Assembly symmetry: C3
Homo-oligomer: 333 residues x 3
């Protein structure tokens, strides 16, 4: 087909955990969906102690923004590497077919840009990440990863073929960082990326993250940046991990319908407490809130959650249901 005959629609991305506006059920035929991202190398403070790293980002955030299209749309990405950056970058879409997911076609030095197009032939949530030959895990584990959602044209379906429609969506990107340590255990700091590279490699080879965070930092999805919902609302939480396994859990809730490995032609798993998202994958969980209050959303390696950073909060408004749960006798001597 002549792609030039198709509609074009430009998306304006938003910072995670929010997601750009879209339609669950496609209201048009196939489109070329136009995205732009600008790579930004920047310093980021990732914990309460003030540890500062040299992060590598798509669009200034860890994770990069969630892109949303429908099955058999074309994704057309303008990828910009400004001359204020110092490294070579590219992009690999797990949603795409060919050329190492696009990485072989999108190598951009500082001061260059490129435009890639691919057909989104499979529905699901997928990781995208930078992948420069020879330096792949360093870029990924410096924050250079995000996700793309390819919705079925008729939206999501349950295990029986009935519609599932979310009221809200959030994107939680989980990042393992490997901050080099000296013998005594304190983090080391580096003057340039080249001077850091060997100790970055050493640190990665321990297979032991120093930090595991949501939305780029310890506590990022707490306090005034907690996730929010109301009792009765249907929420989809997209979760990605580009490099290492995770096991999400909503403390006080469930995954009512979960695609743990993220691919919508498969029936969802029902009533999950915890789900495994393998490293290199995006997954999605659908839940209808039934109680108000604070929930924690965690990686249920609780060490990873509460000691290394992989924990966020929901604040949920509405009525308490004492049939579902109540304190019969409050704590007392």
């Amino acid at each position: 087909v002549d792609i030039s005959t198709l509609p074009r629609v430009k998306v304006d991305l938003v910072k995670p955990p929010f997601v750009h506006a879209h339609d669950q059920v496609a209201k048009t035929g196939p489109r070329v969906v136009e995205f732009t991202m600008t790579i930004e190398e920047k310093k980021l403070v990732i914990d309460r102690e003030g540890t500062e790293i040299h992060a590598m980002t798509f669009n200034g955030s860890v994770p990069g923004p969630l892109m949303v299209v429908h099955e058999n749309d074309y994704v057309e990405l303008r990828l910009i590497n400004p001359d204020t950056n110092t490294l070579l970058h590219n992009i690999d879409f797990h949603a795409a077919t060919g050329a190492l997911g696009g990485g072989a076609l999108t190598q951009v030095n500082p001061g260059e840009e490129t435009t890639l197009r691919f057909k989104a032939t499979k529905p699901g949530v997928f990781v995208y990440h930078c992948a420069p030959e020879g330096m792949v895990p360093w870029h990924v584990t410096s924050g250079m990863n995000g996700a793309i959602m390819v919705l079925p044209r008729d939206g999501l379906k349950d295990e029986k073929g009935q519609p599932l429609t979310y009221d809200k969506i959030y994107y939680v990107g989980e990042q393992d960082f490997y901050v080099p340590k000296d013998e005594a255990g304190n983090y080391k700091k580096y003057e340039t990326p080249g001077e850091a590279y060997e100790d970055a490699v050493k640190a990665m080879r321990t297979l032991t993250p120093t930090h595991i965070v949501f939305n780029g930092a310890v506590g990022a999805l707490t306090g005034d940046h907690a996730l929010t919902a109301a009792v009765g609302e249907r929420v989809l939480v997209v979760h990605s991990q580009a490099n290492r396994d995770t096991r999400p859990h909503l403390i006080g809730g469930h995954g009512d319908y979960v695609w743990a490995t993220g691919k919508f032609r498969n029936p969802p798993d029902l009533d999950q407490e915890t789900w495994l998202i393998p490293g290199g994958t995006a997954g999605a969980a659908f839940y209808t809130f039934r109680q108000p209050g604070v929930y924690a959303y965690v990686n249920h390696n609780l060490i990873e959650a509460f000691e290394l950073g992989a924990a966020g909060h929901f604040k949920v408004t509405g009525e308490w249901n004492d049939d579902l749960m109540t304190s019969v006798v409050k704590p007392a001597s």
Copy 2:
């Protein structure tokens, strides 16, 4: 509904790996099922070397006992923290909805008790664990976790909707411990829980368990405490891991029907060799024994099994089937 109009039934729990008597198919309407557990902080010897830790238990065991109810029963738990203990505790049920699984409503100092009720709205096996704010992974990885089984009212079903009925059930709780080590690698010992806390946190942050055990100790499910079955018997093995992934395997057998992430509205996976139970989850495997003899039941990271403790035995009685397996020529020069 007025819960006060429902039948009440008191359960008397038993020590793992055994399970209190119950009905697979519900013989009554919905009930309030009454449980009591008493928290016990105690010293436990966990390996053959004599390493002794300060364990934190529900009902004196690691894991805590398996609770069994049916879908849409109410679970009413009296949780007692005697004044002989020294720490604050609570309980989070992954089966429950709201208040951080019950943890926000069940904080008990030594000398206090509380009673929680929740509706068991989803069928499956689920983890429960202590979760005191700020100290969650330390309590969990000190042994303070167990599981609850919420059976469908019409019992278990295979992938075709046909009944599956077990003859025996066992509960295997798998515990990762993080015993602090000095520089030379020997375990450190501590005078009080507060003096131990920072090195406990340090030890956990390595993400490398020193011990991974079934039923609280190396070898606990061997010798006179081996699991038992007969050829032809249908056995359900419930397995939980509150904090870290595991991959159970019956050496010499299979999981004929497995709910690896534990939730019975989903069809089981058939004919598994090994299954992944993510940290924070309970799973269940159904097997019909076909050969007698010794079987090993293991986490199939074989280092975790045979060097760190995650191995137990079945002793199975009955006839040998030479059609299924035989030595044609015994080992010989």
Copy 3:
């Protein structure tokens, strides 16, 4: 039945990643399928640095060869331990039922052989591995493992019950090695297996592989030993990991149909980006190539892939499809 009345067929095995000739749909009734393997202890160079270990192999390779039979065939294995070896060995088939998978019946000292027969009652891909009592993880993590495929008699089926027929098959065995290190981090070398055993145990107990490789060495499945396919070809990739989780990914492709835990009575997962194969399991992924060029096949812990060795290549011939992917604007200032 009198097994002596059944046809016998002798298989001549081939070195991974290739697979001996077989039929997907069984062209005969049930057979006794005869295999022979000779154990070989040998030195192997496993990385580009020249690190040499004392490997323990079935048939001289890491992994051991893929065996292929059909459901309800009998597997009859002659296992030979020549007197040029120094250790005791045996074999455990995860496909088999009884006697610890055969290990209790196949203990062979150097200079001995044995013949085991078992009925392959369950279809799927399964691990096999050595398992000498007391020394199990050392033999497995020295390379002594492979896989067996038990095909359904009517071949593979998709999620709808329609045939899936592969044009090519490859077997990727992934091996975690634990090469002991001194305090400074250099590999230690040993004079005899007994002198190595305690430091091998110490190294394993860190749960941190020094090397994670495909087909026995860093780079083994690259260059002149890259995997090959053509656009339009249907390829099945069998992947096993006898001891540790992995998460395969075809960079630039997908798993169109995946049995992540390897058992063919279950419907496959569709359109996977990445899949989790738990330690102790074999899995299988089916893909139809749609684009030519180089693909990387990796464990998508990218540190494990690109820094520790768990990466191979496909070279795919044929036409480029610009509808599926194209560079709209090549990288430029």
